[PDB]
Amino acid sequence: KREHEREVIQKAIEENNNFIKMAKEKLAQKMESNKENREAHLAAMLERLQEKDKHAEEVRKNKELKEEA
Amino acid sequence: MREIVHIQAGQCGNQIGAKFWEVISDEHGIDPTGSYHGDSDLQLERINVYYNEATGNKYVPRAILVDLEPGTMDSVRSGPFGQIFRPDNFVFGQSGAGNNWAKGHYTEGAELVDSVLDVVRKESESCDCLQGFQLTHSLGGGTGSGMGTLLISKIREEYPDRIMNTFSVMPSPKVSDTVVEPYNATLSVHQLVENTDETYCIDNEALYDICFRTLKLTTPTYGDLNHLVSATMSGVTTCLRFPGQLNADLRKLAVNMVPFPRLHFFMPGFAPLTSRGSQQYRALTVPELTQQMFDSKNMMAACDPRHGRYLTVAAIFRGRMSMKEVDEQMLNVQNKNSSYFVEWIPNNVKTAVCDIPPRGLKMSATFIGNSTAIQELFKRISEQFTAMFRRKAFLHWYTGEGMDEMEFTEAESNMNDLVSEYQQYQDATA
Ligand SMILES: CC[C@H](C)[C@@H]([C@@H](CC(=O)N1CCC[C@H]1[C@H](OC)[C@@H](C)C(=O)N[C@H](C)[C@@H](O)c1ccccc1)OC)N(C)C(=O)[C@@H](NC(=O)[C@@H](NC)C(C)C)C(C)C
Numbered sequence A: 001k002r003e004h005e006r007e008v009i010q011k012a013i014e015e016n017n018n019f020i021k022m023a024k025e026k027l028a029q030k031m032e033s034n035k036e037n038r039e040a041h042l043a044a045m046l047e048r049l050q051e052k053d054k055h056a057e058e059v060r061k062n063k064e065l066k067e068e069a
Numbered sequence B: 001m002r003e004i005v006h007i008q009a010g011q012c013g014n015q016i017g018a019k020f021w022e023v024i025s026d027e028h029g030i031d032p033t034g035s036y037h038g039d040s041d042l043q044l045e046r047i048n049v050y051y052n053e054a055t056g057n058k059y060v061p062r063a064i065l066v067d068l069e070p071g072t073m074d075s076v077r078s079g080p081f082g083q084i085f086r087p088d089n090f091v092f093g094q095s096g097a098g099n100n101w102a103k104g105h106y107t108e109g110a111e112l113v114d115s116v117l118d119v120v121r122k123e124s125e126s127c128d129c130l131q132g133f134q135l136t137h138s139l140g141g142g143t144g145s146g147m148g149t150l151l152i153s154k155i156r157e158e159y160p161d162r163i164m165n166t167f168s169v170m171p172s173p174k175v176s177d178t179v180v181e182p183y184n185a186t187l188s189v190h191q192l193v194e195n196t197d198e199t200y201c202i203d204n205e206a207l208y209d210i211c212f213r214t215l216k217l218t219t220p221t222y223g224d225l226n227h228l229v230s231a232t233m234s235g236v237t238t239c240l241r242f243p244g245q246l247n248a249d250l251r252k253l254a255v256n257m258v259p260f261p262r263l264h265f266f267m268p269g270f271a272p273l274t275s276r277g278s279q280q281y282r283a284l285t286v287p288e289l290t291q292q293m294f295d296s297k298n299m300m301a302a303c304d305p306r307h308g309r310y311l312t313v314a315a316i317f318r319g320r321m322s323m324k325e326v327d328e329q330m331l332n333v334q335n336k337n338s339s340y341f342v343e344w345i346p347n348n349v350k351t352a353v354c355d356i357p358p359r360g361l362k363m364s365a366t367f368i369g370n371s372t373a374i375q376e377l378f379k380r381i382s383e384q385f386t387a388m389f390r391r392k393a394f395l396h397w398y399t400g401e402g403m404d405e406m407e408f409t410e411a412e413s414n415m416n417d418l419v420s421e422y423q424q425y426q427d428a429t430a
């Protein structure tokens, strides 16, 4: 009976600890995934804007090429 | 000098425990300060059964007060008889047990139980010749039920050859709306079947119904309920406390009352039934005492004794009366209703008479029955248990404390086995 009593309270501790552990890990996973997704969305936006800048350089390059002819 | 050590646990346990000490202190002529002021030598002759002697000829209850929250014990320490208790014998926590057997038995109670056992040990060591223990508690809450049965098991381990006696208050939906009480009670009965020698089944269902039906109290209080309990506890301990022939110690009582070790759950009864301050002016006659003490309406367990058979009976008469008339009337009950007494235990009804009446009465009588009808009580608890357990309802409160469902299944099976064993001897012929 005493061994059983010890087992019950260690079980209660273990399940509480495991709850905390899994909550902790779920949250770290979610936060890392969110961080990476948001950063990727910004990176893509900037990438498109930078392609506009390049395009604009070509337009002016094109105008300069046309000009002397 | 055969000492009994008294333990009271949880709210109910301490409430009825404190009332027990008020009632028997007055009977023994001990005042709230522990000073004796009585007029009869009969009062002191076996005073050492329940009291230690101090210097100044102070008498101190051999009582240990236990709870997982301070409220009720603060109440007691501020009550009338608060000072009478040994201050170091107050053992309490702060967390409470939240009406949860698992908290009392496995988690919260486990943190406190060694402290209690330390006090128990100090009291036992002081004993010339310890008889055993008596515990007051309810089965429906968390501390008295869970920690109370934890204590019973630990005390049995340290004192395996001593008698363990309990006054156990059974829950009823007539008195409590807490949904988990049938769980707490079933888990506790499982413990009691294995580890006590004698258990007085004090049923809140019966207590409430006596107050409402018989005493005509439209709004019964715990005070009213406990008035019945303390009258009963006084009556059933009379043979332990005063000079006498029959059932004069815990072991002799058990040998007279318990023919099979698991069947040690007693139905108490009392007459006359009174409310607090009813203060009645006519004494009952011996025939009246005898008729009423055996009546269903006077039982403290809500079981119809006519639905079962008596294995054994103890009857205690108190007051100045004709012992001849007592004998005649007791014989009349048995000879008039002989079919309700098992025929394979000859002469199974024993009678004691004590000259000192309880306070406020000239005449009273107390009944202790080992009846197979007590199965009705366990059946009632079992039905309430199964209604929830079949859907595993409210179990998360228990599994959160580390318990497994298997433990519930085992407790239920053991109580249903107990029920079946009563039925077996009910139907048994010589
Ligand atoms: C039938 C169930 C108990 C018995 C009563 C009783 C509780 C009581 O006695 N309580 C609540 C602690 C205070 C105590 C009494 O005040 C009312 C004091 C005077 C007392 O009796 N005090 C005694 C002397 C004291 O030793 C003591 C004992 C136990 C606990 C605390 C204090 O109050 C009527 N209750 C809950 C009720 O009647 C409640 N009704 C119900 O619960 C109903 N269901 C909604 C049914 C079960 C009756 C109403 C209050 C809503």
Ligand SMILES: Nc1nc2c(ncn2[C@@H]2O[C@H](COP(=O)(O)OP(=O)(O)O)[C@@H](O)[C@H]2O)c(=O)[nH]1
Binding pocket: B009, B010, B011, B012, B013, B015, B016, B097, B098, B099, B100, B137, B138, B139, B140, B141, B142, B143, B144, B145, B169, B170, B171, B172, B175, B176, B181, B204, B207, B222, B225, B226, B229
């Ligand atoms: N007869 C009686 N029953 C009580 C008293 N106090 C609580 N109860 C009952 O005891 C059960 C609740 O247990 P309680 O002792 O309050 O919980 P604990 O403090 O955890 O042991 C319920 O069935 C209540 O109706 C009391 O003073 N007298």
Ligand SMILES: [Mg+2]
Binding pocket: B011, B141
């Ligand atoms: Mg309570």
